[PDB]
């Protein structure tokens, strides 16, 4: 089955975490959810799955659009998923509010 890529490898390939070991720690900390639930490092990624993950102190919800074992460049990897519009908005709004409480 050459259509089986682990969630920890995937998260690293998609550049969400610097190393697979870190991606594995985040998963085990419950900081990454797969279709709304705790997952595991060895979970095989499926196209269109919904992943919710912690980025520093940001939360992003992305939909898996491609699977690969290669970690490509910044702009290139970024193409293995599509962040949801609701996720981008939530992030923005929190960022804005941050900059607001700042100018006050």
Curated annotation (Swiss-Prot):
Q: Which residues form the S4 RNA-binding domain?
A: 5-67
Instruction: Give the keywords, sorted.
Output: DNA-binding, RNA-binding, Stress response
Classify the source by domain of life.
Answer: Bacteria
Q: Return one Gene Ontology term, BP aspect.
A: response to heat
Q: Does DNA-binding count among this protein's keywords?
A: yes
Expression triggers: By heat shock.
Cellular component, GO annotation: cytosol
- Asked if the keyword DNA-binding belongs to this entry, the reply reads yes
The Gene Ontology terms for molecular function here are:
DNA binding; ribosomal large subunit binding; single-stranded RNA binding
Q: What interactions and quaternary structure are annotated? A: Monomer.
What is this protein for, i.e. what is its function? Involved in the recycling of free 50S ribosomal subunits that still carry a nascent chain. Binds RNA more specifically than DNA. Binds with very high affinity to the free 50S ribosomal subunit. Does not bind it when it is part of the 70S ribosome.
Similarity comment text for this entry: Belongs to the HSP15 family.
Q: What is the protein name given in its UniProt record?
A: Heat shock protein 15
What organism is this sequence from? Answer: Escherichia coli (strain K12)
Per the UniProt record, the lineage of the source organism begins with: Bacteria, Pseudomonadati, Pseudomonadota, Gammaproteobacteria, Enterobacterales
Q: Which residues of the full protein are shown?
A: 5 to 108 of 133
């Amino acid at each position: 089955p050459a259509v089986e890529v682990r969630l920890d490898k995937w998260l690293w390939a998609a550049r969400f975490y610097k190393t697979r070991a870190l991606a594995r720690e985040m998963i085990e900390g419950g900081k990454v959810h797969y279709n709304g639930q705790r997952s595991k490092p060895s979970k095989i990624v499926e196209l269109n799955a919904t992943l919710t993950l912690r980025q520093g102190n940001d939360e992003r919800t992305v939909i898996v659009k491609a699977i690969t074992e290669q970690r490509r460049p910044a702009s290139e990897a970024a193409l293995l998923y599509e962040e949801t519009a609701e996720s981008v908005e939530k992030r923005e709004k929190m960022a804005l509010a941050r900059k607001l409480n700042a100018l006050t």
